[PDB]
């Protein structure tokens, strides 16, 4: 009941907790968090700029908290400031600023509550150097510097000791302000005592008592965690080189094995290149890895003079020796471990980000629509046939035809030899017998080697030279990619659609369904089915949730722009289950809609079929008004929502000089059918529609006017480019 | 717990290993026989530290092997139930926490955890904070425990820890 | 039945030699030293490799003198052998913590006697 019986959508599982609703006071903070968090390491969206990206993250993040609107519900479909303002169809990276702002606020609030409780307890015990509550407001105010709240926030909040009912050298603040100022303005205890004179309030006779206290105070400080941070993580060279056994154990396949001179490596080797970070992180696990800055020997030398005494007469010399010794004791713990942890975290994040960008880019570039039908589609589309077997990956000698509405619906073949090396009539006789009794429109082959290419070319010649394409017209096999039956043929759709057929028939049905609708092949699978396809070698060392979110956001954006057929998910088994990657219709809303429409005889008459029958709720139906399309409401099969129908009908009547109907009970208007555009584009100007929508409608019709004009002129038309070259890497 | 005991073993040796390297070869065969193993009697032996003596090798009648009762010193690791040990926190999960007691690992359910130590799955790091966020108990922390039940799994010890006792946390 | 809380140990284990966490560290790292200082040597087992760390985390001291002294200050008293290690690894900062942790110390000793054993142990701590 939380997926289809509530007020709207819940399928945005990457952000629906921390960023799942926006108040008024948090919208500016979340937009600032998104603009401040969205560009730290790489130059991303420097897309709109700083003010335009901060207002796109604030306006989209504050808008998604009403009605649940996200993805195809407003980002990746219009000329407005949706999120970062880039051309990408997936909004999941712009909603990351909203989720991050919400997670940072929650963490800052809990920590501020903790700081108040601890400060009150420490003050009540102190009045009835001491630890105090003064870090609680400074930590609770710094929501952007989360890692400052880890090294310094965990050093101040863990430095209290955590137990409750519920003068040794310089200070930490002065050493910090002297170390972070680049000049140590304050010295150590400039007194005629040495470092061991403060041990008399150690019990072992040791001069090392004060050095441990100074290191413990120095390593917990927010100021040192900020001062050390971003100096080496922003700029260290990726000095990775081979080990004694690693130069032989790797063999130039990883980042540490490839470069024996890599100890001079550039600072981009893990932050701009994913492969260098992935190789340095993976080679270090078994044999060894080279990851070192080499900038501390000089980054650590200039901080040694600050916080030390300038004189040496056993007063300033003891204070200077105590300051130098305490700085050396605190650097190896706090600065050493902090610098190592930042370098390691930065390398892993940079390698994972490069791998995740490569996997998301590959999935977005491959996920697009281009069915292998006749001419790319008498009637519409047709038999998108091809050989799954023969010389390719399938065993049987024959072909199967994709039915346009899904995968392959028929097949045939013949065992004639192209078999043994002495035969020349056998393969041609089998090809003629299979092509003569079946009416195709197209061909493809699931190839795997030199013999598969030869058999495809020979069958293409035997089909083209014999008129086996249409029985009065030329057509046969080629380099067109039948390999889409390789993974979809062994799937649950290919096994439930045909259970007596061999793997050659399953591969031919998979190939023919790439020839009928790869958007139905992508939407008809679970997403587990998308992760079986590799997108990069550095994606395996990355977290799989990033590639799944990138693929899911790309698939949801491509489905929201390509149109969803309402009638195509009711009767055809290969076109069903397409309501999963739509805007405001996640798995639950889509699955409930399919069950209720099949069980009740509810058909897709218009876009208000889920709003009129009480199957859907106002928020999911408003945020999903741009994705649901039907076969017949005449604006029902397009991107036109219920609020834009009147303006789009009025524009279609005004552009033709004949729309006398006021949106109902009258002649003409733009909504009469999706197959034809208006007769006059110079009649409907953008300024008149943008001025009329700002005063009657409560919204600017500037960016929406082109989409509203196009949705009335061209129904069911996809926004994403798809296809490629079958003879190059797009089919081989 | 780490103990030192005298153990014994009888090893078989094939005639190809006779000649001047013989008793060296007897030492080699034990060092790569009884190391890192576990038993339902003595428990998990970490290493053989030295060999006490070789008993004279009894030549097997019929077959050419000879067997060598070698006595040896062993550092053995046998946990008992009710012992209070230190460990490192390995994995923080809503189903339970995972620790590691040397060669032997343990696991702590939220059942054994009183309700103070709540979950933290929203955070990048899974931790067990309290309501006020003062007592931070996350992965890779030297967290004490008490062995409340032992279990041997085919030459493999698997105890179970708890958090019921006070002073079971950060030192 | 086997509960070290009530000090019940098998006959095979009663005569056993207790070991300290810091003490065994010297035995293991010396075994590492003996074998790694041998040329033509096979790699040691993953069981050896995964344990050296454990005792390292809990090294209250390395020093060969403190390996003896936390034992000698204890053996002088009328403690069990079992008590020898649990009290010398944990280093409970008070007899109260130790008596809460260890059920066998409760009523066993004066708190101040046990506290001085533990204070002598804390003053051995690196």
**Tokens 């530290």 belong to residue:** B49
Looking at the structure, tell me whether residues B74 and B59 fall in a common domain.
yes
Relative to beta strand B44-54, strand B104-108 is unpaired
Within a 10 A sphere around the Cβ of A712, how many other Cβ atoms? 30
Looking at the structure, tell me whether residues B68 and B129 fall in a common domain.
no
Packing angle of the helix pair A95-126, A50-63 (nearest 10 deg): 90
Set of chain A residues whose Cβ sits within 8 Å of the Cβ of B135: 162
Q: Which residues contact B25 (CB under 8 A, 6 or more apart)?
A: B13, B17
CA distance C104 to C81: 12
Helix (H) or strand (E) holding A116: helix A95-126
CA distance A492 to A500: 14
Helix (H, G, I), strand (E, B) or coil at B48: strand
Which tokens sit at B70? 């070698």
CA distance A336 to A106: 31
Q: Which residues contact C27 (CB under 8 A, 6 or more apart)?
A: B49, B75
CA distance B83 to C94: 18
Which tokens sit at B154? 């085919």
Q: How far is CA A408 from CA A291, A574, B127, in A?
A: 53, 9, 52
Within a 10 A sphere around the Cβ of A686, how many other Cβ atoms? 13
Looking at the structure, tell me whether residues B142 and B122 fall in a common domain.
yes
Set of chain B residues whose Cβ sits within 8 Å of the Cβ of C55: 102
CB-based contact A343:A211 (threshold 8 Å): no
Q: Which residues contact A177 (CB under 8 A, 6 or more apart)?
A: A185, A186, A223
Relative to beta strand A384-386, strand A398-402 is antiparallel
CA distance A35 to A33: 6
Of A103, A111, A154, nearest to B122 by CB-CB distance is A103
Q: Which residues contact A270 (CB under 8 A, 6 or more apart)?
A: A238, A276, A277, A280, A346, A347, A350, A351
Residues of B (85-124) whose Cβ lies below 8 Å from A: 122-123
Provide the resolution (angstroms).
3.0
Q: Note whether B134 contacts A117, CB cutoff 8 Å.
A: yes
How far from the centroid of its chain's Cα atoms is residue A281's Cα?
22
Query: Within 13 Å of residue A732, how many CA atoms lie on the same side as its CB?
Result: 11
CB-based contact B158:B44 (threshold 8 Å): no
Q: Tell me how far apart the terminal alpha carbons of chain C are, to the nearest angstrom.
A: 37
CA distance A687 to A699: 13
**Tokens 């590639």 belong to residue:** A547
CB-based contact A347:A267 (threshold 8 Å): no
Q: How many residues does chain B have?
A: 171
Q: How far is CA B81 from CA A170, B112, C87, C101, in A?
A: 49, 16, 17, 14
Q: How many CB pairs under 8 A join B and C?
A: 85
Looking at the structure, tell me whether residues B62 and B38 fall in a common domain.
yes
Within a 10 A sphere around the Cβ of A492, how many other Cβ atoms? 12
Calculate how close chain A gets to B61, using CA atoms only, in Å: 48
Looking at the structure, tell me whether residues B103 and B156 fall in a common domain.
yes
Within a 10 A sphere around the Cβ of A315, how many other Cβ atoms? 16
> Considering just the CA atoms, what is the radius of gyration of chain C in Å?
17
Which one of B80, B98, B116 terminates a domain?
A: B80
* Paired residues of B99 in beta bridges: B89, B106
Of A17, A117, A158, nearest to B132 by CB-CB distance is A117
Helix (H, G, I), strand (E, B) or coil at A316: helix
3-state secondary structure A524-545: CCCCCCCCCCCCCHHHCCCCHH
Alpha helices in A208-273 (DSSP H): 209-219, 222-227, 246-249, 255-258
CB-based contact A210:A322 (threshold 8 Å): yes
3-state secondary structure A597-655: HHHHCCCCCCCCHHHHCCCCCHHHHHHCCCCEECCCCCCCCCCCCCCCHHHHHHHHHHC
Domain count across chain B: 2
Neighbouring subunits of C (3+ Cβ pairs under 8 A): B
Within a 10 A sphere around the Cβ of C86, how many other Cβ atoms? 21
Looking at the structure, tell me whether residues B85 and B167 fall in a common domain.
yes
For chain A, the maximum distance between any two Cα atoms, rounded to a whole number of angstroms, is: 110
Q: Give the residue among A148, B5, A415 at the shortest CA–CA distance from C11.
A: B5
Calculate how close chain B gets to A587, using CA atoms only, in Å: 23
Calculate how close chain C gets to B54, using CA atoms only, in Å: 21
> Considering just the CA atoms, what is the radius of gyration of chain B in Å?
23
Q: How many residues does chain C have?
A: 126
Which residues of A have a CB under 8 Å from any CB of B? 17-18, 103, 106-107, 110-111, 113-114, 117-118, 154, 157-158, 160, 162, 164, 166
Domain of residue B28, CATH code: 3.30.1490.120
CB-based contact C54:B101 (threshold 8 Å): yes
Q: Give the residue among A390, A514, A410, A395 at the shortest CA–CA distance from A456.
A: A390
Helix, strand, coil shares of chain A, percent, nearest 5, are 45, 5, 55
CA distance A118 to A160: 9
Nearest 5°: phi and psi at A411?
-165, 165
Helix (H, G, I), strand (E, B) or coil at A206: coil
Q: Note whether C54 contacts B101, CB cutoff 8 Å.
A: yes
CB-based contact A366:A723 (threshold 8 Å): no
CA distance B150 to B44: 13
Experimental technique used?
Answer: cryo-EM
**Sheet arrangement for strand A408-413:** A384-386, A398-402, A408-413
Residue B60: DSSP 8-state? P
Residue A408: DSSP 8-state? E
Of A18, A106, A162, nearest to B134 by CB-CB distance is A162
CA distance A342 to A348: 10
- Distinct helix (H) and strand (E) counts, chain B: 1, 8
Which residues of C have a CB under 8 Å from any CB of B? 2-6, 9, 12-13, 16-21, 24, 27-28, 31, 45-48, 50-51, 54-55, 57-58, 85-86, 89-90, 92, 97, 100-102
Looking at the structure, tell me whether residues B90 and B147 fall in a common domain.
yes
Within a 10 A sphere around the Cβ of B15, how many other Cβ atoms? 11
Looking at the structure, tell me whether residues B117 and B62 fall in a common domain.
no
Looking at the structure, tell me whether residues B68 and B15 fall in a common domain.
yes
CB-based contact A518:A530 (threshold 8 Å): no
Neighbouring subunits of A (3+ Cβ pairs under 8 A): B
CA distance A24 to B11: 79
Looking at the structure, tell me whether residues B137 and B112 fall in a common domain.
yes
Helix (H, G, I), strand (E, B) or coil at A503: helix
CB-based contact A622:A36 (threshold 8 Å): no
Q: For residue B171, what is the nearest residue in chain A, using CA coordinates?
A: A161
How far from the centroid of its chain's Cα atoms is residue A624's Cα?
21
Which one of B80, B112, B133 terminates a domain?
A: B80
Calculate how close chain A gets to B139, using CA atoms only, in Å: 14
Looking at the structure, tell me whether residues B26 and B67 fall in a common domain.
yes
Q: Note whether B46 contacts C28, CB cutoff 8 Å.
A: yes
CA distance A478 to A412: 18
CA distance C119 to C117: 6
Set of chain C residues whose Cβ sits within 8 Å of the Cβ of B49: 27, 31
CA distance A471 to A463: 10
**Whole domain around residue B100: which residue ranges?**
81-171
Set of chain B residues whose Cβ sits within 8 Å of the Cβ of C12: 41-42
Give the burial string for B34-64 (b: 16+ CB within 10 Å, else e): bbbbbeeebbbbbbbeebeebeebeeeeeee
**Tokens 């492969």 belong to residue:** A275
Which tokens sit at A71? 């993805």
CA distance A91 to A71: 5
CA distance B67 to B59: 7
Alpha helices in A255-368 (DSSP H): 255-258, 274-286, 316-330, 336-366
> Considering just the CA atoms, what is the radius of gyration of chain A in Å?
33
Residues of B (124-143) whose Cβ lies below 8 Å from A: 132-136
CA distance A71 to A13: 13
Helix (H, G, I), strand (E, B) or coil at A495: helix
Of C27, C45, C58, nearest to B49 by CB-CB distance is C27
Helix (H, G, I), strand (E, B) or coil at B67: strand
Helix (H, G, I), strand (E, B) or coil at A412: strand
**Tokens 């002649």 belong to residue:** A667
Which tokens sit at A167? 């003068």
CB-based contact A509:A406 (threshold 8 Å): no
Domain of residue B126, CATH code: 2.40.50.140
Looking at the structure, tell me whether residues B59 and B31 fall in a common domain.
yes
């Amino acid at each position: 009941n939380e997926i289809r019986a509530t007020d709207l959508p819940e399928r945005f599982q990457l952000r629906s907790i921390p960023v799942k609703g926006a108040e008024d006071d948090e919208l500016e903070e979340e937009a600032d968090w998104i603009y401040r968090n969205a560009f730290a390491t790489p130059t991303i969206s420097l897309s709109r700029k700083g003010p335009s990206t901060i207002q796109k993250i604030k306006e989209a993040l504050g808008f998604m908290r009403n009605q649940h609107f996200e993805v195809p519900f407003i980002a990746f479909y219009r000329k407005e400031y949706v999120e970062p303002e880039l051309h990408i169809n997936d909004l999941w990276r712009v909603w990351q600023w909203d989720e991050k702002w919400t997670q940072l606020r929650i963490r800052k609030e809990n920590l501020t509550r903790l700081f108040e409780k601890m400060q009150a307890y420490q003050y009540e015990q102190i009045s009835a150097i001491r630890a105090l509550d003064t870090t609680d407001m400074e930590r609770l105010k710094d929501v952007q510097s989360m890692d400052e709240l880890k090294d310094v926030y965990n050093h101040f909040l863990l430095y209290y000791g955590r137990d409750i009912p519920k003068k040794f050298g310089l200070t930490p603040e002065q050493f910090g302000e002297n170390l972070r100022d680049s000049y140590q303005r304050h010295e150590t205890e400039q007194f005629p005592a040495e470092p061991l004179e403060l041990a008399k309030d150690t019990p072992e006779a040791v001069l090392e008592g004060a050095r441990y206290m100074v290191a413990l105070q120095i390593a917990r400080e927010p100021l040192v965690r900020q001062v050390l941070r971003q100096t080496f993580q922003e700029r260290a060279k990726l000095n990775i080189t081979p080990t004694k056994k690693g130069r032989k154990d790797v063999d130039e396949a990883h980042y540490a094995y490839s470069f024996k001179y890599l100890k001079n490596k550039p600072v981009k080797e893990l932050r701009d290149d994913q492969f260098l970070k992935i190789c340095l992180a993976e080679d270090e696990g078994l044999l060894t890895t080279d990851i070192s800055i080499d900038l501390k020997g000089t980054y650590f030398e200039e901080i040694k003079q600050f916080y030390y005494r300038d004189e040496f007469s056993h007063q300033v010399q003891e204070w200077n020796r105590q300051r130098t010794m305490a700085i050396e004791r605190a650097l190896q713990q706090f600065l050493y471990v902090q610098m190592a942890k930042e370098l390691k975290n930065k390398l892993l994040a940079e390698a994972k980000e490069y791998v995740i960008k490569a996997c998301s880019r590959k999935l977005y570039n491959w996920l697009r629509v281009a069915p292998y039908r006749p001419d790319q589609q008498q009637g519409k589309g047709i038999r998108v046939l091809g050989i799954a077997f023969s010389s390719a990956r399938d065993h049987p000698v024959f072909c199967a035809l994709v039915n346009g509405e899904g995968e392959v619906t028929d097949f045939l073949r013949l065992p004639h030899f192209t078999e043994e090396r002495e035969k020349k009539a056998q393969d041609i006789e089998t090809l003629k017998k299979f092509l003569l009794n079946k009416k195709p429109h197209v061909v493809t082959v699931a190839g795997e080697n030199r013999d598969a290419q030869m058999l495809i070319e020979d069958v293409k010649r035997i089909v083209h030279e014999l008129d086996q394409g249409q029985q009065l017209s030329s057509i046969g096999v080629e380099l067109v990619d039948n390999e889409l039956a390789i993974l979809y043929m062994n799937s649950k759709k290919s096994e439930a659609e045909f259970r007596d057929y061999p793997p050659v028939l399953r591969q031919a049905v998979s190939l023919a369904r790439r020839i009928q609708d790869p958007l139905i092949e992508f939407a008809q699978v679970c997403s587990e089915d998308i992760l079986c396809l590799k997108f990069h070698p550095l994606q395996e060392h990355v977290v799989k949730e990033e590639l799944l979110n990138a693929l899911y956001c790309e698939f949801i954006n491509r489905v929201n722009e390509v149109g969803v057929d309402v009638n195509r998910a009711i009767a055809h088994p290969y076109s069903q289950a397409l309501i999963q990657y739509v805007c405001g219709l996640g798995p639950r809303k889509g699955t409930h809609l399919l069950k209720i429409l099949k069980q009740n005889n509810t058909r897709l008459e218009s876009r208000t079929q889920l709003v009129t029958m009480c199957h859907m709720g106002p928020k999911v139906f408003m945020n999903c008004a741009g994705f649901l399309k039907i076969d017949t409401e005449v604006l029902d099969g397009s991107r036109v929502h219920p609020e834009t129908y009147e303006w789009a009908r009025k524009m279609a009547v005004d552009a033709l000089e004949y729309d006398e109907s006021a949106e109902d009970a009258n002649p003409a208007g733009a909504l009469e059918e999706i197959l034809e555009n208006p007769e006059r584009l110079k009649d409907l100007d953008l300024d008149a529609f943008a001025e009329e929508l700002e005063r009657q409608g409560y919204g600017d019709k500037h960016i929406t006017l082109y989409d509203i004009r196009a949705e009335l002129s061209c129904r069911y038309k996809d926004l994403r480019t798809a296809y490629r070259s079958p003879n190059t890497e797009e089919i081989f | 717990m780490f103990y030192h005991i005298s153990l014994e073993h009888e090893i078989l040796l094939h005639p190809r290993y006779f000649g001047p390297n013989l008793l060296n070869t007897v030492k080699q065969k034990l060092f790569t026989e009884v190391e890192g193993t576990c038993t339902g009697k003595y428990g998990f032996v970490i290493a053989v530290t030295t060999i006490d003596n070789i008993g004279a090798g009894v030549i097997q009648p019929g077959r050419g092997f000879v067997l060598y009762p070698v006595k040896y010193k062993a550092i053995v690791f046998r946990p008992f139930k009710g012992e209070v040990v230190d460990a490192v926190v390995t994995q923080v999960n809503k189903v339970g926490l995972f620790t590691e007691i040397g060669p032997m690992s343990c696991f702590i359910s939220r059942h054994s955890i009183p309700s103070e130590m709540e979950f933290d799955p929203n955070s990048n790091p899974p931790c067990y904070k309290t309501m006020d966020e003062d007592i931070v108990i996350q992965q890779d922390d030297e967290i004490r425990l008490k062995i409340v039940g032992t279990r041997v799994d085919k030459n493999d010890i698997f105890a179970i820890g708890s958090l019921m006792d006070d002073y079971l946390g950060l030192v | 039945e086997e509960d070290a809380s009530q000090l019940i140990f098998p006959k095979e284990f009663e005569t056993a030699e207790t070991l300290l966490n810091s003490e065994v560290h010297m035995l293991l790292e010396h075994r590492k030293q003996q074998n790694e200082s041998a040329e033509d040597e096979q790699e040691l087992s993953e069981v050896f490799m995964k344990t050296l760390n454990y005792t390292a985390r809990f090294s209250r001291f390395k020093n060969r003198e403190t390996i003896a002294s936390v034992r000698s200050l204890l053996l002088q008293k009328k403690l069990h052998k079992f008590e020898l290690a649990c009290l010398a690894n944990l280093c409970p900062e008070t007899a109260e913590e130790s008596k809460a942790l260890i059920p066998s110390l409760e009523g066993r000793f004066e708190d101040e006697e046990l506290q001085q054993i533990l204070d002598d142990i804390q003053t051995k701590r690196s």
